[PDB]
Amino acid sequence: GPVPSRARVYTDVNTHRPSEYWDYESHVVEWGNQDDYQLVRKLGRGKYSEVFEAINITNNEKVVVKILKPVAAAKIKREIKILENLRGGPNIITLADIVKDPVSRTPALVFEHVNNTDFKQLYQTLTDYDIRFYMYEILKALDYCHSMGIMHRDVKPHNVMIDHEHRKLRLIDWGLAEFYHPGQEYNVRVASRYFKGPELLVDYQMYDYSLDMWSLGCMLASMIFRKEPFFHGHDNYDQLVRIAKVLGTEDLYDYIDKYNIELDPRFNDILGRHSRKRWERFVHSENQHLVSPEALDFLDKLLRYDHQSRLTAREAMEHPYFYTVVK
Protein backbone atom coordinates (compact mmCIF):
# COMPACT_ATOMS: atom_id res chain seq x y z
CA GLY A 1 0.00 0.00 0.00
CA PRO A 2 1.08 3.67 0.38
CA VAL A 3 4.60 4.52 1.64
CA PRO A 4 4.44 6.42 5.00
CA SER A 5 5.45 10.05 5.44
CA ARG A 6 6.36 12.34 8.28
CA ALA A 7 6.98 16.05 8.57
CA ARG A 8 10.62 17.21 8.18
CA VAL A 9 10.16 19.71 11.05
CA TYR A 10 8.31 19.70 14.40
CA THR A 11 7.86 15.97 14.22
CA ASP A 12 8.21 15.41 18.05
CA VAL A 13 6.34 18.43 19.42
CA ASN A 14 3.25 16.54 20.67
CA THR A 15 5.15 13.57 22.15
CA HIS A 16 7.29 15.92 24.31
CA ARG A 17 4.33 18.00 25.57
CA PRO A 18 2.16 16.72 28.47
CA SER A 19 -0.81 14.63 27.21
CA GLU A 20 -3.08 17.44 28.49
CA TYR A 21 -1.73 19.55 25.61
CA TRP A 22 -3.11 17.47 22.67
CA ASP A 23 -5.69 15.13 24.32
CA TYR A 24 -8.56 17.59 23.61
CA GLU A 25 -11.25 15.00 24.61
CA SER A 26 -10.02 15.07 28.25
CA HIS A 27 -10.00 18.92 28.43
CA VAL A 28 -12.47 20.44 30.92
CA VAL A 29 -14.01 23.64 29.49
CA GLU A 30 -14.11 26.66 31.84
CA TRP A 31 -17.41 28.50 31.13
CA GLY A 32 -17.80 32.29 31.27
CA ASN A 33 -20.91 34.47 31.81
CA GLN A 34 -23.18 34.53 28.72
CA ASP A 35 -24.84 37.81 30.06
CA ASP A 36 -21.52 39.67 29.59
CA TYR A 37 -22.25 39.61 25.83
CA GLN A 38 -24.99 41.45 23.94
CA LEU A 39 -25.44 40.30 20.34
CA VAL A 40 -25.52 43.27 17.93
CA ARG A 41 -25.79 41.87 14.38
CA LYS A 42 -25.43 38.63 12.51
CA LEU A 43 -22.27 38.67 10.38
CA GLY A 44 -22.66 35.26 8.74
CA ARG A 45 -23.65 31.62 8.88
CA GLY A 46 -21.65 28.58 7.71
CA LYS A 47 -21.95 24.78 7.89
CA TYR A 48 -20.69 24.72 11.49
CA SER A 49 -21.63 28.07 13.13
CA GLU A 50 -23.49 31.40 13.15
CA VAL A 51 -21.19 34.41 13.62
CA PHE A 52 -22.29 37.63 15.37
CA GLU A 53 -20.85 41.03 16.16
CA ALA A 54 -21.42 41.66 19.88
CA ILE A 55 -20.42 43.95 22.75
CA ASN A 56 -18.76 42.84 25.97
CA ILE A 57 -20.83 44.91 28.42
CA THR A 58 -18.15 44.56 31.20
CA ASN A 59 -15.83 46.89 29.14
CA ASN A 60 -18.01 48.17 26.19
CA GLU A 61 -15.54 46.49 23.74
CA LYS A 62 -16.60 44.84 20.49
CA VAL A 63 -16.28 41.05 20.25
CA VAL A 64 -17.19 38.38 17.73
CA VAL A 65 -19.38 35.46 18.89
CA LYS A 66 -19.26 32.13 17.00
CA ILE A 67 -22.33 30.08 18.11
CA LEU A 68 -21.49 26.49 17.13
CA LYS A 69 -24.17 24.42 15.34
CA PRO A 70 -25.06 21.00 16.88
CA VAL A 71 -22.05 18.96 15.60
CA ALA A 72 -19.71 16.15 16.81
CA ALA A 73 -18.64 17.31 20.31
CA ALA A 74 -15.08 16.08 19.44
CA LYS A 75 -14.74 18.85 16.77
CA ILE A 76 -15.75 21.58 19.32
CA LYS A 77 -13.35 20.49 22.14
CA ARG A 78 -10.57 20.25 19.51
CA GLU A 79 -11.10 23.85 18.31
CA ILE A 80 -11.24 25.12 21.91
CA LYS A 81 -8.01 23.27 22.89
CA ILE A 82 -6.15 24.53 19.80
CA LEU A 83 -7.29 28.14 20.41
CA GLU A 84 -6.23 27.97 24.06
CA ASN A 85 -2.86 26.33 23.13
CA LEU A 86 -2.12 29.08 20.55
CA ARG A 87 -3.51 32.08 22.48
CA GLY A 88 -1.13 35.02 22.53
CA GLY A 89 0.92 33.65 19.61
CA PRO A 90 1.93 35.92 16.72
CA ASN A 91 -1.08 36.90 14.62
CA ILE A 92 -3.29 34.13 16.09
CA ILE A 93 -6.93 35.24 16.78
CA THR A 94 -7.50 35.58 20.55
CA LEU A 95 -10.21 33.42 22.12
CA ALA A 96 -11.57 35.83 24.80
CA ASP A 97 -14.21 33.52 26.35
CA ILE A 98 -16.40 30.42 25.99
CA VAL A 99 -20.08 30.58 27.07
CA LYS A 100 -23.16 28.33 26.71
CA ASP A 101 -25.61 30.08 24.34
CA PRO A 102 -29.03 30.17 26.08
CA VAL A 103 -30.96 29.71 22.80
CA SER A 104 -28.90 27.09 20.87
CA ARG A 105 -27.87 25.16 24.03
CA THR A 106 -24.43 24.91 22.35
CA PRO A 107 -21.00 26.50 23.00
CA ALA A 108 -20.42 30.07 21.82
CA LEU A 109 -16.78 31.04 21.29
CA VAL A 110 -16.04 34.72 21.98
CA PHE A 111 -13.14 36.25 20.00
CA GLU A 112 -11.39 39.60 19.96
CA HIS A 113 -12.89 41.82 17.31
CA VAL A 114 -10.81 42.79 14.27
CA ASN A 115 -11.98 46.00 12.46
CA ASN A 116 -11.17 44.18 9.21
CA THR A 117 -10.69 45.70 5.78
CA ASP A 118 -13.12 44.38 3.19
CA PHE A 119 -11.82 41.25 1.36
CA LYS A 120 -12.44 42.71 -2.13
CA GLN A 121 -10.55 45.93 -1.23
CA LEU A 122 -7.62 43.88 0.04
CA TYR A 123 -7.54 41.74 -3.16
CA GLN A 124 -7.83 44.79 -5.40
CA THR A 125 -5.57 47.34 -3.71
CA LEU A 126 -2.82 45.66 -1.68
CA THR A 127 0.50 46.72 -3.26
CA ASP A 128 3.62 44.59 -4.05
CA TYR A 129 5.11 45.77 -0.77
CA ASP A 130 1.85 45.04 1.15
CA ILE A 131 1.67 41.48 -0.26
CA ARG A 132 5.22 40.80 0.95
CA PHE A 133 4.56 42.44 4.33
CA TYR A 134 1.32 40.53 4.97
CA MET A 135 2.67 37.21 3.65
CA TYR A 136 5.50 37.58 6.21
CA GLU A 137 2.88 38.18 8.91
CA ILE A 138 0.93 35.00 7.85
CA LEU A 139 4.22 33.03 8.02
CA LYS A 140 4.72 34.16 11.64
CA ALA A 141 1.27 32.66 12.46
CA LEU A 142 1.96 29.46 10.52
CA ASP A 143 5.44 28.84 11.94
CA TYR A 144 4.00 29.47 15.41
CA CYS A 145 1.13 27.01 15.07
CA HIS A 146 3.30 24.40 13.32
CA SER A 147 5.99 24.80 16.08
CA MET A 148 3.16 24.17 18.51
CA GLY A 149 2.29 20.86 16.78
CA ILE A 150 -0.84 22.12 15.01
CA MET A 151 -1.80 22.37 11.34
CA HIS A 152 -4.53 24.91 10.34
CA ARG A 153 -5.85 22.92 7.29
CA ASP A 154 -8.06 25.83 6.08
CA VAL A 155 -5.61 28.53 4.93
CA LYS A 156 -7.47 30.78 2.47
CA PRO A 157 -8.03 34.55 2.13
CA HIS A 158 -11.34 34.69 4.05
CA ASN A 159 -9.56 33.06 7.06
CA VAL A 160 -6.89 35.81 7.09
CA MET A 161 -8.27 39.05 8.51
CA ILE A 162 -6.46 42.35 7.96
CA ASP A 163 -7.14 45.68 9.69
CA HIS A 164 -5.13 47.57 7.06
CA GLU A 165 -5.06 50.93 8.98
CA HIS A 166 -3.18 49.26 11.86
CA ARG A 167 -1.04 46.85 9.65
CA LYS A 168 -2.65 44.11 11.83
CA LEU A 169 -3.27 40.57 10.59
CA ARG A 170 -5.05 37.63 12.25
CA LEU A 171 -5.37 34.01 11.18
CA ILE A 172 -8.92 32.86 12.14
CA ASP A 173 -11.28 29.84 11.84
CA TRP A 174 -9.39 27.01 13.62
CA GLY A 175 -12.41 24.66 13.35
CA LEU A 176 -10.56 22.37 10.87
CA ALA A 177 -7.20 22.63 12.72
CA GLU A 178 -5.66 19.38 13.98
CA PHE A 179 -2.76 18.21 16.15
CA TYR A 180 0.06 16.68 14.06
CA HIS A 181 1.10 13.20 15.24
CA PRO A 182 3.69 11.40 13.10
CA GLY A 183 2.16 8.43 11.27
CA GLN A 184 -1.44 9.54 11.79
CA GLU A 185 -3.82 9.19 8.87
CA TYR A 186 -6.00 12.24 8.57
CA ASN A 187 -9.23 13.02 6.81
CA VAL A 188 -8.52 14.47 3.31
CA ARG A 189 -11.88 16.33 3.36
CA VAL A 190 -10.23 19.54 4.70
CA ALA A 191 -9.37 22.99 3.22
CA SER A 192 -11.45 24.81 0.57
CA ARG A 193 -11.42 23.28 -2.98
CA TYR A 194 -9.12 25.92 -4.60
CA PHE A 195 -6.59 25.64 -1.70
CA LYS A 196 -6.60 21.81 -1.35
CA GLY A 197 -3.08 20.36 -1.64
CA PRO A 198 -2.33 17.55 -4.16
CA GLU A 199 -2.03 15.17 -1.16
CA LEU A 200 -5.77 15.67 -0.43
CA LEU A 201 -6.74 15.41 -4.15
CA VAL A 202 -4.91 12.06 -4.56
CA ASP A 203 -6.30 10.76 -1.22
CA TYR A 204 -2.95 10.55 0.63
CA GLN A 205 -3.89 10.65 4.34
CA MET A 206 -0.47 10.83 6.06
CA TYR A 207 -0.04 14.57 5.47
CA ASP A 208 1.34 17.30 7.75
CA TYR A 209 1.95 21.04 8.31
CA SER A 210 3.17 21.34 4.68
CA LEU A 211 -0.50 21.25 3.52
CA ASP A 212 -0.77 24.84 4.85
CA MET A 213 2.23 25.90 2.74
CA TRP A 214 0.49 24.66 -0.45
CA SER A 215 -2.64 26.65 0.54
CA LEU A 216 -0.47 29.73 1.19
CA GLY A 217 1.09 29.32 -2.28
CA CYS A 218 -2.40 29.25 -3.87
CA MET A 219 -3.21 32.50 -2.02
CA LEU A 220 0.05 34.12 -3.18
CA ALA A 221 -0.38 33.01 -6.82
CA SER A 222 -3.89 34.51 -6.91
CA MET A 223 -2.66 37.79 -5.48
CA ILE A 224 0.44 38.30 -7.62
CA PHE A 225 -1.08 37.06 -10.89
CA ARG A 226 -4.50 38.71 -10.36
CA LYS A 227 -6.36 35.45 -10.91
CA GLU A 228 -9.03 34.53 -8.42
CA PRO A 229 -8.69 31.60 -7.70
CA PHE A 230 -5.38 30.59 -9.29
CA PHE A 231 -6.37 26.86 -9.68
CA HIS A 232 -10.04 27.03 -10.66
CA GLY A 233 -11.36 23.45 -10.49
CA HIS A 234 -15.02 22.67 -11.23
CA ASP A 235 -14.81 19.88 -8.56
CA ASN A 236 -12.05 18.02 -6.57
CA TYR A 237 -11.07 15.96 -9.64
CA ASP A 238 -10.86 18.85 -12.08
CA GLN A 239 -8.96 20.69 -9.30
CA LEU A 240 -6.04 18.26 -9.75
CA VAL A 241 -6.22 18.62 -13.56
CA ARG A 242 -6.01 22.43 -13.17
CA ILE A 243 -2.87 21.97 -11.06
CA ALA A 244 -1.41 19.50 -13.58
CA LYS A 245 -1.94 22.01 -16.44
CA VAL A 246 0.56 24.29 -14.62
CA LEU A 247 2.96 21.96 -12.77
CA GLY A 248 2.84 19.21 -15.39
CA THR A 249 1.85 15.57 -15.27
CA GLU A 250 5.38 14.00 -15.10
CA ASP A 251 6.08 15.44 -11.63
CA LEU A 252 2.59 14.34 -10.57
CA TYR A 253 3.28 10.74 -11.60
CA ASP A 254 6.69 10.89 -9.84
CA TYR A 255 4.88 12.08 -6.64
CA ILE A 256 2.30 9.29 -6.71
CA ASP A 257 5.09 6.76 -7.57
CA LYS A 258 7.26 7.91 -4.62
CA TYR A 259 4.42 7.44 -2.13
CA ASN A 260 3.12 4.26 -3.84
CA ILE A 261 -0.33 5.97 -4.25
CA GLU A 262 -3.05 4.43 -6.40
CA LEU A 263 -4.60 7.31 -8.42
CA ASP A 264 -8.44 7.14 -8.67
CA PRO A 265 -9.03 5.55 -12.18
CA ARG A 266 -11.52 8.44 -12.84
CA PHE A 267 -8.32 10.46 -13.60
CA ASN A 268 -7.26 8.24 -16.56
CA ASP A 269 -9.65 9.95 -19.00
CA ILE A 270 -9.24 13.60 -17.72
CA LEU A 271 -5.62 14.26 -16.62
CA GLY A 272 -4.06 14.19 -20.13
CA ARG A 273 -0.34 14.94 -20.61
CA HIS A 274 0.96 18.39 -19.70
CA SER A 275 4.38 19.88 -19.40
CA ARG A 276 5.34 22.19 -16.56
CA LYS A 277 4.73 25.81 -17.50
CA ARG A 278 7.30 28.48 -16.67
CA TRP A 279 5.85 30.98 -14.14
CA GLU A 280 6.48 33.84 -16.63
CA ARG A 281 3.58 32.36 -18.74
CA PHE A 282 1.16 33.92 -16.20
CA VAL A 283 2.66 37.48 -16.28
CA HIS A 284 0.78 40.15 -18.18
CA SER A 285 0.47 43.95 -18.22
CA GLU A 286 -2.22 43.96 -15.45
CA ASN A 287 -0.17 41.93 -12.89
CA GLN A 288 3.40 43.01 -13.80
CA HIS A 289 3.45 45.46 -10.84
CA LEU A 290 3.17 42.49 -8.41
CA VAL A 291 5.62 40.10 -10.05
CA SER A 292 9.36 39.88 -9.51
CA PRO A 293 11.96 37.11 -9.94
CA GLU A 294 11.96 36.69 -6.09
CA ALA A 295 8.11 36.37 -6.01
CA LEU A 296 8.21 33.68 -8.72
CA ASP A 297 11.06 31.78 -7.07
CA PHE A 298 9.22 31.85 -3.72
CA LEU A 299 5.97 30.70 -5.32
CA ASP A 300 7.81 27.91 -7.15
CA LYS A 301 9.10 26.57 -3.81
CA LEU A 302 5.59 26.48 -2.18
CA LEU A 303 3.66 25.00 -5.11
CA ARG A 304 5.25 21.58 -5.28
CA TYR A 305 3.40 18.29 -5.54
CA ASP A 306 5.70 16.53 -3.06
CA HIS A 307 4.59 17.87 0.33
CA GLN A 308 8.04 17.00 1.76
CA SER A 309 9.76 19.25 -0.82
CA ARG A 310 7.87 22.50 -0.04
CA LEU A 311 9.47 25.28 1.96
CA THR A 312 8.53 25.17 5.66
CA ALA A 313 7.14 28.40 7.17
CA ARG A 314 10.49 29.16 8.83
CA GLU A 315 12.47 28.49 5.58
CA ALA A 316 9.94 30.70 3.72
CA MET A 317 10.69 33.62 6.09
CA GLU A 318 14.37 33.41 4.99
CA HIS A 319 13.47 33.95 1.31
CA PRO A 320 14.75 36.94 -0.70
CA TYR A 321 11.11 37.94 -1.50
CA PHE A 322 11.02 39.32 2.07
CA TYR A 323 14.35 41.21 2.07
CA THR A 324 12.49 44.44 1.23
CA VAL A 325 10.08 44.10 4.17
CA VAL A 326 10.96 46.31 7.18
CA LYS A 327 11.71 44.08 10.22
Ligand SMILES: Nc1ncnc2c1ncn2[C@@H]1O[C@H](COP(=O)(O)OP(=O)(O)O)[C@@H](O)[C@H]1O
Ligand atom coordinates in the same frame (compact mmCIF):
# COMPACT_ATOMS: atom_id res chain seq x y z
N1 LIG B 1 -12.57 38.02 15.04
C1 LIG B 1 -13.35 38.52 14.08
N2 LIG B 1 -13.46 39.87 13.97
C2 LIG B 1 -14.25 40.36 13.01
N3 LIG B 1 -14.99 39.72 12.11
C3 LIG B 1 -14.86 38.39 12.24
C4 LIG B 1 -14.09 37.73 13.18
N4 LIG B 1 -14.21 36.36 13.02
C5 LIG B 1 -15.04 36.22 12.02
N5 LIG B 1 -15.47 37.41 11.49
C6 LIG B 1 -16.40 37.60 10.39
O1 LIG B 1 -17.48 36.71 10.52
C7 LIG B 1 -18.20 36.78 9.27
C8 LIG B 1 -19.09 35.57 9.12
O2 LIG B 1 -18.28 34.37 9.06
P1 LIG B 1 -18.99 33.01 8.59
O3 LIG B 1 -19.08 32.98 7.10
O4 LIG B 1 -20.25 32.82 9.37
O5 LIG B 1 -17.93 31.92 9.08
P2 LIG B 1 -17.95 30.30 9.14
O6 LIG B 1 -17.96 29.84 7.71
O7 LIG B 1 -16.69 29.91 9.88
O8 LIG B 1 -19.21 29.94 9.89
C9 LIG B 1 -17.10 36.96 8.21
O9 LIG B 1 -17.44 38.03 7.34
C10 LIG B 1 -15.83 37.26 9.01
O10 LIG B 1 -15.08 38.33 8.48
Ligand SMILES: N#CCc1c[nH]c2ccc(Br)cc12
Ligand atom coordinates in the same frame (compact mmCIF):
# COMPACT_ATOMS: atom_id res chain seq x y z
N1 LIG C 1 -6.55 37.10 -1.75
C1 LIG C 1 -6.94 37.96 -1.11
C2 LIG C 1 -7.32 39.08 -0.25
C3 LIG C 1 -6.83 38.87 1.13
C4 LIG C 1 -7.58 38.61 2.24
N2 LIG C 1 -6.76 38.37 3.31
C5 LIG C 1 -5.45 38.49 2.92
C6 LIG C 1 -4.26 38.38 3.64
C7 LIG C 1 -3.06 38.54 2.98
C8 LIG C 1 -3.06 38.84 1.62
BR1 LIG C 1 -1.40 39.15 0.75
C9 LIG C 1 -4.23 38.97 0.89
C10 LIG C 1 -5.45 38.80 1.54
